[PDB]
Amino acid sequence: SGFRKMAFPSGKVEGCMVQVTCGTTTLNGLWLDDVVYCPRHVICTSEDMLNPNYEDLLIRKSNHNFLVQAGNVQLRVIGHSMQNCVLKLKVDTANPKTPKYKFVRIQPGQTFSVLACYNGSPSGVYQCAMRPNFTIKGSFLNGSCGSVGFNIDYDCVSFCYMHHMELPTGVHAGTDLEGNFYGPFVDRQTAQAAGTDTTITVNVLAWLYAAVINGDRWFLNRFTTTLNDFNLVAMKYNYEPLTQDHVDILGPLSAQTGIAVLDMCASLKELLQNGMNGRTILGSALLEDEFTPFDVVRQCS
Amino acid sequence: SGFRKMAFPSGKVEGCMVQVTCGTTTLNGLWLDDVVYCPRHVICTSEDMLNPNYEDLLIRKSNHNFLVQAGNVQLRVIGHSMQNCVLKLKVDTANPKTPKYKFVRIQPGQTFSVLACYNGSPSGVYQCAMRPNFTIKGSFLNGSCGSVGFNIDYDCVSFCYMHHMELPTGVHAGTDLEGNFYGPFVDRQTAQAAGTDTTITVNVLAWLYAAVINGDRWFLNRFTTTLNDFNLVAMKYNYEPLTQDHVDILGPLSAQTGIAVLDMCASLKELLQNGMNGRTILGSALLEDEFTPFDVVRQCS
Ligand SMILES: CC(C)[C@@H](NC(=O)C(F)(F)F)C(=O)N[C@@H]1CN(C(=O)c2cncc3cccnc23)CC[C@H]1c1cc(F)cc(Cl)c1
Ligand SMILES: CC(C)[C@@H](NC(=O)C(F)(F)F)C(=O)N[C@@H]1CN(C(=O)c2cncc3cccnc23)CC[C@H]1c1cc(F)cc(Cl)c1
């Protein structure tokens, strides 16, 4: 027992991280087969960062404008192109450590592991969630661009995130591996702000279940709510609406614990209205929303 | 910006995890060079559980009584010995993925990463701390024994923890890689309990410094404290004593923020007295004690 924020093992991804240099910009690249993926802003200098014309910055460049370095060794760049906000550099050598992989785009509410990297070297791994406002609450410093987020299913690495930027509130934005942003953001040095965030209701409920499973039960009551009454309360507290699909998804945990979802919803409604009355749930004095139902099942089995 | 519970990249350790079976017992082992380390209780049957004599059980075993599997490959065992509570199995193949490593024994308050494994297969990575009562608040199920805790410093893996057991309160106990337990615990199914846990004061202080570095000052106050007065108050909330050593260790963070250590102690005393009153620090509504000064420096700007 016990319940922790857990990331996937990161070895398969560490084997793919490289350093990409263009002029005096350095950041991280993902090396899969014979192509390296990195943010397109690598080709941008500070003079242009304010209002970059990527087409024009790229047209001016050749293979020899990029240097790719995997640990000790230079990879020779033999082609280059851009897909949305990602630069693709073709190299003369396939990565022998390439895992079975897919590129997937995730939905808000879904979680993934981030391997934070600097100068092409993996430095730490943590778990986070795609927020409803399409940011992530990461931990990222200068040089972290091109770090990736991933999930693992079987032996297959699903890459879902590449890091591009930080917003004024201190949260992070990036793209999928095909270079489409999550959220209404652009890759230029300009004032941009995240929309009001909301809480991921379904995840909170999942985590309440994990709490029950670990013997934290003080927040249960005899009562039950409806979906419609619950959503009225949710709306009030900037929680995402709970849909019938969410209810379905929690079916396993509901049957496992003997607490019906609309019962858990009544608990959660009470917690929103009254607070925790000085108590904690799973070592937390706030309602945690970065664990999915699947994560809860994964860890509790 | 941002601050996250961050683990070390697990790849170097993933390449060392194997499965060890003896009789009907299967658990995890750590394959370094031509040695597999695992908990000695792998040789205990369901009858031996209360008062096993491990020396007596081991002398009855042949090399061929132990099955070691790495992926699909059987490793032939060609020798065995016991050191304290760890079994060492000599195998005929040195692990080609052996990283640079050391074995270290850590002290209460120190943090490390855990690679949770089942059947020799890594399933997740998380960060935790050696509690003052010599337990860790892990997340482990049946079959997790042999999972290890580690730090990485400059490509060198410091292994500091091997998982052996769970206590009644749901927390976890184990040994260093020389097989000495942390704490008074024993590898027997006899009645054992964790002593009262206390908060790692030096770590809470470090984490307040992290909050300042990250741009939040709301909890500071105009006061200072003597070290003695600090301890007399903090111990009333079950916090560990802060020592002159701790104070020296916080000097770097003191210098970067310009807040004297004793001033930060005054801030903590007030937090303990007042609570958060609806506010958070670094995303948390309680005082986090599982980041060391070193962890904060590592992760922070
Ligand atoms: C409005 C945003 C575009 C901007 N935001 C801010 O500067 C602010 F205000 F939020 F800090 C931003 O993230 N600029 C990045 C910063 N950077 C990093 O390595 C970096 C990454 N993650 C967190 C950090 C924390 C501290 C310092 N650095 C980082 C280098 C590349 C640069 C960039 C990205 C891009 F997509 C397009 C262009 Cl042209 C330039
Ligand atoms: C007093 C403790 C010795 C005992 N715990 C209790 O009795 C308590 F307190 F949990 F009820 C305990 O941990 N037994 C372990 C359990 N185990 C696990 O795989 C295991 C590991 N981590 C978490 C789990 C969570 C759920 C189920 N299993 C696990 C198999 C091996 C066994 C063992 C270890 C040992 F060192 C000596 C002997 Cl002879 C037997």
Cβ atoms of A177 and A37 within 8 Å: the answer is: yes
Residue A137 Cα, ligand 1 centroid: separation in angstroms?
15
Long-range contacts (CB closer than 8 Å, 24 or more residues apart) made by B64-73: B65/B22, B65/B23, B66/B20, B66/B21, B66/B22, B67/B20, B67/B21, B67/B22, B68/B18, B68/B19, B68/B20, B68/B21, B68/B29, B68/B31, B68/B36, B69/B18, B69/B19, B69/B21, B69/B120, B70/B18, B70/B19, B70/B31, B70/B95, B70/B120
- Elucidation technique: X-ray
Six token digits for residue B9? 């990249």
Question: Dihedral angle at the C-alpha atoms of B154, B155, B156, B162, nearest 10 degrees?
Answer: 120
Output DSSP code: residue B267: H
For chain A, the distance separating the N- and C-terminal CA atoms, rounded to the nearest angstrom, is 10
- The DSSP result for chain A, as a single string, is ------BPP-HHHHTTEEEEEETTEEEEEEEETTEEEEEGGGG--TTTTTS--HHHHHHT--GGGEEEEETTEEEPEEEEEEETTEEEEEESS--TTPPSEEE-PPPTT-EEEEEEEETTEEEEEEEEE--TTS-B-----TT-TT-EEEEEETTEEEEEEEEEEE-TTS-EEEE-TTSPBSSS--SSSS--------B-HHHHHHHHHHHHHTT--TT--S----HHHHHHHHHHTTBPPPPHHHHHHTHHHHHHHT--HHHHHHHHHHHHHH--TT--BTTBSS------HHHHHHHT-
* Distance from the A45 Cα atom to the nearest Cα atom in chain B, whole angstroms: 22
Question: Dihedral angle at the C-alpha atoms of A172, A177, A180, A182, nearest 10 degrees?
Answer: -30
Beta strands A101-103 and A156-166: pairing type? parallel
Exposure letters B74-99 (e unless 16+ CB within 10 A, then b)? ebebeebebeebbbbbbbeeebeebb
Q: Hunting for tokens 């370094």 — which residue is that?
A: B32
Q: Can you tell me which atom of ligand 2 is nearest the CA of B49?
A: 39
Longest alpha-carbon distance in chain A: 69
Between CA A114 and CA A144 the distance in angstroms is 11
Cβ atoms of A37 and B171 within 8 Å: the answer is: no
Contacting residues of A for B126, CB less than 8 Å apart: 4-7
Same domain as A106, residue A74 = no
Tell the residue nearest (CA) to atom 19 of ligand 2. Answer: B142
For residue B47, give the 3-state DSSP assignment: coil
Q: Hunting for tokens 């074995």 — which residue is that?
A: B103
State which amino acid sits at residue B119.
N
Q: Across chain B, how many H-helices and E-strands are there? A: 8, 13
Same domain as B144, residue B6 = yes
Residues belonging to chain B with any Cβ–Cβ distance to chain A shorter than 8 Å: 1-12, 14-15, 115-116, 122-126, 128, 137-141, 166, 170-172, 214-215, 276, 280, 283-286, 299, 301
Same domain as B160, residue B125 = yes
Six token digits for residue B235? 């111990």
Resolution in Å equals 2.0
To test the ligand 1 pocket, which listed residue (A38, A189, A192) has its Cβ within 8 A of the most ligand atoms? A189
Between CA A148 and CA A126 the distance in angstroms is 11
Same domain as A9, residue A149 = yes
Cβ atoms of A97 and A157 within 8 Å: the answer is: no
Length of chain B: 301
The CATH number of the domain holding residue A92 is 2.40.10.10
Cβ atoms of B251 and B244 within 8 Å: the answer is: no
Domain boundary among A164, A197, A230: A197
Same domain as B285, residue B155 = no
Beta strands A35-39 and A25-32: pairing type? antiparallel
Same domain as A283, residue A203 = yes
Between CA B293 and CA B204 the distance in angstroms is 9
For residue B81, give the 3-state DSSP assignment: strand
| Cβ contact A2–B137 (<8 Å) | yes
- The DSSP result for A236-252, as a single string, is HTTBPPPPHHHHHHTHH
| Cβ contact A214–B170 (<8 Å) | yes
Q: Which residues pair with B88 in a beta bridge?
A: B37, B81
The CATH number of the domain holding residue A246 is 1.10.1840.10
Six token digits for residue A68? 């790719």
Domain boundary among A50, A69, A99: A99
Nearest 5°: the CA angle A239, A152, A9 is 100
Same domain as A259, residue A169 = no
Q: Hunting for tokens 């934070």 — which residue is that?
A: A116
Output DSSP code: residue B6: -
**Ligand lying nearest the CA atom of residue B49:** 2
Q: Which of A1, A115, A287 to mutate to test the interface with B (most CBs of B within 10 A)?
A: A1
Output DSSP code: residue B190: S
- Which residues have CB under 8 Å from B218's CB, separation 6+? B279
| Cβ contact A9–B122 (<8 Å) | yes
- The residues of B annotated as belonging to the active site are 41, 145
Residue B99 Cα, ligand 1 centroid: separation in angstroms?
34
- The DSSP result for B123-142, as a single string, is EEEEEEE--TTS-B-----T
Between CA A250 and CA A268 the distance in angstroms is 14
CB atoms within 10 A of CB A281: 21
Q: How many CB pairs under 8 A join A and B?
A: 116
Same domain as B209, residue B168 = no
Between CA B61 and CA B87 the distance in angstroms is 12
Residue B27 Cα, ligand 2 centroid: separation in angstroms?
12
Same domain as A135, residue A255 = no
CB atoms within 10 A of CB B102: 12
Same domain as A145, residue A106 = yes
Cβ atoms of A174 and A28 within 8 Å: the answer is: no
State which amino acid sits at residue A231.
N
Q: Which residues pair with B102 in a beta bridge?
A: B158
Half-sphere exposure of A164 (CA within 13 A, CB side): 27
Six token digits for residue A204? 């909170």
Domain boundary among B72, B99, B126: B99
Residue A164 Cα, ligand 1 centroid: separation in angstroms?
7
Helix (H) or strand (E) holding B181: none
Total domains in the fold of chain A: 3
Same domain as B188, residue B69 = no
Same domain as B231, residue B93 = no
Domain that holds residue A250: 198-301
Active site residue A160: no
